[PDB]
From a paper:
bMGL was co-crystallized with the C12 ligand mimicking a C14 alkyl MG yielding crystals of space group P21, which diffracted to a resolution of 1.7 Å. Two molecules of bMGL were in the asymmetric unit, and both had the C12 ligand covalently bound in the active site; clear electron density for the entire ligand was observed in both chains. The bMGL·C12 complex structure shows the cap region in an open conformation similar to conformation I. Electron densities for residues Thr-133–Glu-137 in the cap region are absent in the C12 complex structure, similar to the free form of bMGL and the bMGL·PMSF complex (root mean square deviation of all Cα atoms, 0.13 and 0.14 Å, respectively). Representative of these contacts, the side chains of residues from both the α/β-hydrolase core and the cap region, including Phe-29, Ile-125, Ile-128, Leu-142, Leu-167, Leu-170, Met-174, and Val-198, form hydrophobic contacts with the alkyl chain of the C12-ligand bound at the active site in the bMGL-C12 complex. The backbone NH groups of Phe-29 and Met-98 form hydrogen bonds with the O2 oxygen atom of the phosphonate group of the C12 ligand, highlighting that these residues form the oxyanion hole during the course of MG hydrolysis. The bMGL·C12 ligand complex shows the aliphatic chain of the ligand in an almost linear conformation protruding toward the surface. We synthesized p-nitrophenol esters of alkyl phosphonic acids and used them as substrate analogs with different alkyl chain lengths. These compounds react irreversibly with the nucleophilic serine of α/β-hydrolases and are used frequently to capture the tetrahedral reaction intermediates of lipases. The irreversibly and covalently bound ligand is captured in the bMGL·C12, bMGL·C14, and bMGL·C16 complex structures (distance between Ser-OG and the phosphorus atom, 1.6 Å) mimicking the tetrahedral intermediate of carboxylic acid ester hydrolysis.
Monoacylglycerol lipases (MGLs) play an important role in lipid catabolism across all kingdoms of life by catalyzing the release of free fatty acids from monoacylglycerols. Here, we present a comprehensive study of five crystal structures of MGL from Bacillus sp. H257 in its free form and in complex with different substrate analogs and the natural substrate 1-lauroylglycerol. Crystallographic studies of MGLs have resulted in the determination of three-dimensional structures of human MGL (hMGL) and its ortholog from a moderately thermophilic soil bacterium Bacillus sp. H-257 (bMGL) in free form and in complex with inhibitors. Both MGLs possess the expected α/β-hydrolase core domain harboring a catalytic triad. The occurrence of different conformations reveals a high degree of conformational plasticity of the cap region.
Numbering used by the authors: 1 to 132, 138 to 250
């Protein structure tokens, strides 16, 4: 039931103990903490306590991922949330792609979360249903506008894992109205992976009175590492300070 392969260089989780306000950062499907690290480091430098976990079956080998279910990915996030609760009075959650899905999921099950920052979060990806063949699909290159960036992601995607994601997304979509905390929803106009309309499914679905969509015009899907990174960091910091206890 445990991972059989070692953690890849660059895929290590990140923890920083600072003040009583904490931020949980969640990476995406087939990705690793690498996707979120620049944000995590910026938030720690600003005085936040920070938790950037490595999702089970991620950052090792796609064969480990194939052996996980979405419950394992939820468990990794719950564990990180729990780490923060032991240290913080105020907790924010942010995440990219499926990390954004998991951000929404955690807020749907924990009303104490003080605010969320989903980034190109996924609750409906029609491409999965369309395709739903081989045991592993060749991964397409990382969707970044800046070609110089090196993202860390599995070279193959187990198709069985796509079914797990679809289940997680379906459950998350169904429960959106449980979210009442403030929300800052980032979306890349030119996301070629997660259809940008997901931003509006989320905006309309949640019950929050304080919510907004910020469109990113200079990034593709992996916006946390792309040209609009500085803006994501700056606006996220403003959001944390505004809503912190
Ligand atoms: P995010 O967590 C990360 C996207 C970048 N990495 N990748 N992969 O979104 C995960 C879901 C992406 C959409 C998957 C569509 C696959 C369609 C293939 C159809 C085969 C049945």
């Amino acid at each position: 039931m445990s991972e059989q392969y070692p953690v890849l260089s660059g895929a290590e989780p990140f923890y920083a103990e600072n003040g009583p306000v904490g931020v949980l950062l969640v990476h995406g499907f087939t990705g690793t903490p690498h996707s979120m690290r620049p944000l995590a480091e910026a938030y720690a430098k600003a005085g936040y306590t920070v938790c950037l976990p490595r999702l089970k079956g991620h950052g090792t080998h796609y064969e480990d991922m194939e052996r996980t279910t979405f419950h394992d990915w939820v468990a990794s996030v719950e564990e990180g949330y729990g780490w923060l609760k032991q240290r913080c009075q105020t907790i924010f959650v942010t995440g990219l792609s499926m990390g954004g899905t998991l951000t929404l999921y955690l807020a749907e099950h924990h009303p104490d979360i003080c605010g969320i920052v989903p980034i190109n979060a996924a609750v409906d990806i029609p491409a999965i249903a369309a395709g739903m063949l081989p045991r592993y699909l060749d991964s397409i290159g990382s969707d970044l506008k800046n070609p110089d960036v090196k993202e860390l992601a599995y070279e193959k995607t187990p198709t069985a894992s796509l079914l797990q994601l679809a289940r997680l997304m379906a459950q998350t979509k169904a429960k959106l109205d449980r979210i009442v905390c403030p929300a800052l929803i980032f979306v890349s106009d030119e996301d070629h992976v997660v259809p940008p309309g997901n931003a509006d499914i989320i905006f309309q679905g949640i019950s929050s009175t304080e919510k907004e969509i910020v469109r990113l015009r200079n990034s593709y899907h992996v916006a946390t590492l792309d040209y609009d990174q500085p803006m994501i960091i700056e606006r996220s910091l403003e959001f944390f300070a505004k809503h912190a206890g």
